[PDB]
Design a protein around this motif. Sequence first.
Motif, PDB file in Angstrom:
ATOM      1  N   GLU A  35      68.159  42.873  72.893  1.00 17.13           N
ATOM      2  CA  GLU A  35      66.963  43.312  73.601  1.00 17.13           C
ATOM      3  C   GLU A  35      65.705  43.005  72.799  1.00 17.13           C
ATOM      4  OE1 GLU A  35      64.338  45.284  73.759  1.00 17.13           O
ATOM      5  OE2 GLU A  35      64.044  45.078  75.924  1.00 17.13           O
ATOM      6  N   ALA A  36      65.758  43.170  71.477  1.00 22.01           N
ATOM      7  CA  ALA A  36      64.606  42.815  70.654  1.00 22.01           C
ATOM      8  C   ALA A  36      64.309  41.326  70.747  1.00 22.01           C
ATOM      9  CB  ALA A  36      64.850  43.223  69.203  1.00 22.01           C
ATOM     10  N   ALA A  37      65.352  40.496  70.711  1.00 18.56           N
ATOM     11  CA  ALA A  37      65.139  39.062  70.870  1.00 18.56           C
ATOM     12  C   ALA A  37      64.522  38.754  72.229  1.00 18.56           C
ATOM     13  CB  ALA A  37      66.458  38.314  70.694  1.00 18.56           C
ATOM     14  N   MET A  38      64.985  39.438  73.275  1.00 20.74           N
ATOM     15  CA  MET A  38      64.412  39.236  74.601  1.00 20.74           C
ATOM     16  C   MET A  38      62.940  39.632  74.628  1.00 20.74           C
ATOM     17  SD  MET A  38      64.684  38.186  77.627  1.00 20.74           S
ATOM     18  CE  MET A  38      66.440  37.839  77.637  1.00 20.74           C
ATOM     19  N   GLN A  39      62.589  40.727  73.953  1.00 18.60           N
ATOM     20  CA  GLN A  39      61.188  41.134  73.886  1.00 18.60           C
ATOM     21  C   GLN A  39      60.349  40.081  73.176  1.00 18.60           C
ATOM     22  OE1 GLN A  39      59.408  43.132  75.291  1.00 18.60           O
ATOM     23  NE2 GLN A  39      57.536  43.269  74.064  1.00 18.60           N
ATOM     24  N   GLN A  40      60.880  39.510  72.095  1.00 11.81           N
ATOM     25  CA  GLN A  40      60.164  38.433  71.419  1.00 11.81           C
ATOM     26  C   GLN A  40      59.965  37.249  72.354  1.00 11.81           C
ATOM     27  OE1 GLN A  40      58.379  38.150  69.097  1.00 11.81           O
ATOM     28  NE2 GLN A  40      58.207  35.956  68.665  1.00 11.81           N
ATOM     29  N   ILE A  41      60.989  36.925  73.143  1.00 13.18           N
ATOM     30  CA  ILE A  41      60.859  35.848  74.119  1.00 13.18           C
ATOM     31  C   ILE A  41      59.760  36.175  75.120  1.00 13.18           C
ATOM     32  CG2 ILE A  41      62.016  34.630  75.981  1.00 13.18           C
ATOM     33  CD1 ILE A  41      62.982  33.629  73.389  1.00 13.18           C
ATOM     34  N   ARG A  42      59.696  37.429  75.568  1.00  9.97           N
ATOM     35  CA  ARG A  42      58.631  37.826  76.485  1.00  9.97           C
ATOM     36  C   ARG A  42      57.267  37.618  75.846  1.00  9.97           C
ATOM     37  NH1 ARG A  42      60.720  43.664  79.047  1.00  9.97           N
ATOM     38  NH2 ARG A  42      62.942  43.126  78.937  1.00  9.97           N
ATOM     39  N   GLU A  43      57.129  37.997  74.576  1.00  7.02           N
ATOM     40  CA  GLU A  43      55.843  37.838  73.903  1.00  7.02           C
ATOM     41  C   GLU A  43      55.447  36.371  73.807  1.00  7.02           C
ATOM     42  OE1 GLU A  43      55.491  39.573  70.073  1.00  7.02           O
ATOM     43  OE2 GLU A  43      54.600  41.442  70.797  1.00  7.02           O
ATOM     44  N   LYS A  44      56.391  35.502  73.454  1.00  6.83           N
ATOM     45  CA  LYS A  44      56.061  34.108  73.174  1.00  6.83           C
ATOM     46  C   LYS A  44      56.109  33.205  74.401  1.00  6.83           C
ATOM     47  CE  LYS A  44      55.335  34.377  68.728  1.00  6.83           C
ATOM     48  NZ  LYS A  44      54.017  34.045  68.120  1.00  6.83           N
ATOM     49  N   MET A  45      56.598  33.690  75.543  1.00  9.55           N
ATOM     50  CA  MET A  45      56.774  32.804  76.688  1.00  9.55           C
ATOM     51  C   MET A  45      55.442  32.373  77.283  1.00  9.55           C
ATOM     52  SD  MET A  45      55.795  34.162  79.779  1.00  9.55           S
ATOM     53  CE  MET A  45      56.805  33.079  80.786  1.00  9.55           C
ATOM     54  N   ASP A  46      54.433  33.246  77.248  1.00 11.54           N
ATOM     55  CA  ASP A  46      53.161  32.923  77.886  1.00 11.54           C
ATOM     56  C   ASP A  46      52.589  31.612  77.367  1.00 11.54           C
ATOM     57  OD1 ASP A  46      52.788  33.891  75.380  1.00 11.54           O
ATOM     58  OD2 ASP A  46      51.241  35.359  75.901  1.00 11.54           O
ATOM     59  N   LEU A  47      52.887  31.259  76.115  1.00 14.35           N
ATOM     60  CA  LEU A  47      52.431  29.979  75.585  1.00 14.35           C
ATOM     61  C   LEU A  47      53.044  28.817  76.356  1.00 14.35           C
ATOM     62  CD1 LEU A  47      52.706  30.769  71.765  1.00 14.35           C
ATOM     63  CD2 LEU A  47      50.808  31.230  73.325  1.00 14.35           C
ATOM     64  N   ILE A  48      54.314  28.936  76.727  1.00 14.58           N
ATOM     65  CA  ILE A  48      55.046  27.854  77.362  1.00 14.58           C
ATOM     66  C   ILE A  48      55.010  28.037  78.872  1.00 14.58           C
ATOM     67  CG2 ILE A  48      56.534  27.414  75.386  1.00 14.58           C
ATOM     68  CD1 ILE A  48      58.700  29.073  76.799  1.00 14.58           C
ATOM     69  N   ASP A  49      55.371  26.973  79.585  1.00 14.31           N
ATOM     70  CA  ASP A  49      55.517  26.989  81.034  1.00 14.31           C
ATOM     71  C   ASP A  49      56.987  26.774  81.364  1.00 14.31           C
ATOM     72  OD1 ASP A  49      55.753  26.228  83.778  1.00 14.31           O
ATOM     73  OD2 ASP A  49      53.610  25.770  83.819  1.00 14.31           O
ATOM     74  N   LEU A  50      57.560  27.691  82.143  1.00 12.45           N
ATOM     75  CA  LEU A  50      58.978  27.629  82.470  1.00 12.45           C
ATOM     76  C   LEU A  50      59.286  26.660  83.603  1.00 12.45           C
ATOM     77  CD1 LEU A  50      59.680  31.463  82.318  1.00 12.45           C
ATOM     78  CD2 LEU A  50      59.236  29.831  80.472  1.00 12.45           C
ATOM     79  N   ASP A  51      58.277  26.224  84.362  1.00  8.10           N
ATOM     80  CA  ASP A  51      58.529  25.271  85.436  1.00  8.10           C
ATOM     81  C   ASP A  51      59.063  23.956  84.886  1.00  8.10           C
ATOM     82  OD1 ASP A  51      57.469  27.320  86.856  1.00  8.10           O
ATOM     83  OD2 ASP A  51      55.771  26.203  87.689  1.00  8.10           O
TER      84      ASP A  51
END
Lengths: 712, 47
Positions: A395-411
């Motif tokens: 869950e902590a790793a998932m939270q880190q992914i949430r924090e850092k995802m805005d930089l990237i585009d998932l499309d």
Amino acid sequence: DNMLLVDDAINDDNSVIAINSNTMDKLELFRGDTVLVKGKKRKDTVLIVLIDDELEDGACRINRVVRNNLRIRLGDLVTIHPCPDIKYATRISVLPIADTIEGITGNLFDVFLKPYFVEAYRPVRKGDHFVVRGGMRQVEFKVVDVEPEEYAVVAQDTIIHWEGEPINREDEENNMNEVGYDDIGGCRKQMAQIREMVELPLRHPQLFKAIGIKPPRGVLMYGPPGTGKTLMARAVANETGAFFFLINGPEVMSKMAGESESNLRKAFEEAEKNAPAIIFIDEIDSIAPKRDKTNGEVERRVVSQLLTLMDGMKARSNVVVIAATNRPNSIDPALRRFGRFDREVDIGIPDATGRLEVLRIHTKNMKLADDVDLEALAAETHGYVGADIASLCSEAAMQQIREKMDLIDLDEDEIDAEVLDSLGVTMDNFRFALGNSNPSALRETVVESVNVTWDDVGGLDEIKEELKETVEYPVLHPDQYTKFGLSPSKGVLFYGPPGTGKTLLAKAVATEVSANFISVKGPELLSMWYGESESNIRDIFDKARAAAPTVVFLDELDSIASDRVVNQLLTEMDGMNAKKNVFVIGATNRPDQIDPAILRPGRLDQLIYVPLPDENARLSILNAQLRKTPLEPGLELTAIAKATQGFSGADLLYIVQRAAKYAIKDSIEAHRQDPVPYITKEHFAEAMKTAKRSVSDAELRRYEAYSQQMKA
Amino acid sequence: KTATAILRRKKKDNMLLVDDAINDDNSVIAINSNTMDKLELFRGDTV
Ligand SMILES: Nc1ncnc2c1ncn2[C@@H]1O[C@H](COP(=O)(O)OP(=O)(O)OP(=O)(O)O)[C@@H](O)[C@H]1O
Ligand SMILES: Nc1ncnc2c1ncn2[C@@H]1O[C@H](COP(=O)(O)OP(=O)(O)O)[C@@H](O)[C@H]1O
């Protein structure tokens, strides 16, 4: 002493070991003869020896690749043996690894056939990994098959086969078949018990024949779900090296009638064929549950077949049976008799050190940020089993992914690796994940360790000495009592005002003798009376026995004095054998509702009064509370201690809490308009002005009269 | 605040607005030359 120290090697040769002449002299090895190096977890290899006088005596030269294959680190100890039976290989089959061949195509088998095996005579063994340079890449292959057995040497005449398909690398790692002791922590006692129960019958059976005894066969480990029971069983089985054949309870129960019997018979027969072997089971309750609740014929036939197979086990055979169950008493009682599952093992929730070790093991691959204080996480996590810790890490790793995802585009189907380079779990992410967890093991009676000492107790010195004499001495001085013949008492009951520090005394006593504390609050007994609670007091006492020494604690024992639970408690307590290291400590603020039978000899016969802390005791308790919150320099607690006549430890703790809350509020207001990171006199003045007493004087008179009457 | 981070989609130049066409062409779509210049688009190439 033949064990040799593993030393890092600059050279990358995968079948050459350079050693000093003294290394040969110690083992009287001869030049030009291959040697067998064995590491850990049934890992071994054969290497060609060379003489390198530059290397100091006892220092070897093995490339990092071979050490990785053997699953060993730098500076480890490996056993070295000669190879008088050196043999050459006739037919060897090897296949490539796809991720190792990325960037270059074509068949490199022919390319490497001559250059790497031009009369090289490199010793080979099953499962070996060897790296060869092709084009602009260094591709590593695995030894799929070798004939004739066992290891042989790669001769030119050997026929090399390469017909097949690539196999991933991480797939072998994730198979779970390879998990050593290093993958488990916090279960030193249980791990040692299981090892002593399993290894000796299998590794050294001749001991039992020498002493003339039938070795035990039935081992049964039970504990709360997600505690690692399957992982522990797999690790011990792999450590032993004997053939392992698992049986899943849900799987066996999932097939139509008759098929289950066929599967069980085949598994048992196959295990018998390949002795030594170990048979493991999962959710043995599911296949052989309590009969009083499942009267179906299918479960009856399955359990009867299992019993017949267990009975039919032959006298001399290196086979050991293991089982796992969440509830120790859920399984059918017939399996607990002699000649069947009898060696019982209890696994409790790990303590602070155990949680720290588990967290360390799990977080061995994630990109931990610079600031990691796993010790603090272990301290905060109370009542967390290993599975919950793994979930917390995920869950902590998932939270880190949430924090850092805005930089990237998932499309986009591709993600820049530079972003991946920045991935890292911070302490705040762990804090949030800990906030969003859901421990469940603690909600039911489970044996856990406690580390409270006499220092935490503010006074009651006479009670300390009396309880020591009553309990501690027979635990470590049984010989004296045997000599004098005096039997040891067990039933000690505390009575006095509420919130006077009883559970803390019980924890201190349990920690004194190094015993596993068990807590059973009154609501649990009430739920058992109503039958809603899954557990029963029989289960509590069975766990206490299996985890001996233990201290069972019954909080608010007067809440049930209900008569059925009283009778069951009396029966269980009296049936207990006194010589066993099991003690029962009851707590109650109303020593009148207790039935007279509870006070009979061999039961809760010892009565101990708990008084309100004295001024010195109140001062000590106040000092104990104020350990992590800084105080105003020069603060004097004597006035508080003297002004708190008739107060209890809980009341003083509440006073401290409200004073701290006032200080935090003042700090918040000051920040809005940390200049005040501590408490001052005004907060304590406010708290004392807002003081009260949780016990009235009439109650004190009642307790004093009761104590005097008991004394008389 | 951040729990809904995944839901939002980062903005990019290639996404364009939709309007009803004056012409009746179906396989043919017209855009301002400025959009092609920003995207380096030219004539004779399908989209
Ligand atoms: N030392 C450990 N103690 C407990 N769990 C651990 C430990 N190390 C890892 N784990 C994690 O615990 C889980 C392994 O235990 P598992 O959940 O299989 O136990 P169980 O509930 O007793 O099993 P079963 O399914 O056989 O009833 C995995 O999540 C593993 O990652
Ligand atoms: N000797 C003592 N007497 C009273 N309270 C104490 C003593 N030592 C510590 N305490 C504090 O009193 C509190 C007792 O909590 P609790 O167990 O709920 O009440 P009780 O022990 O009376 O059942 C603990 O939080 C502890 O910090």
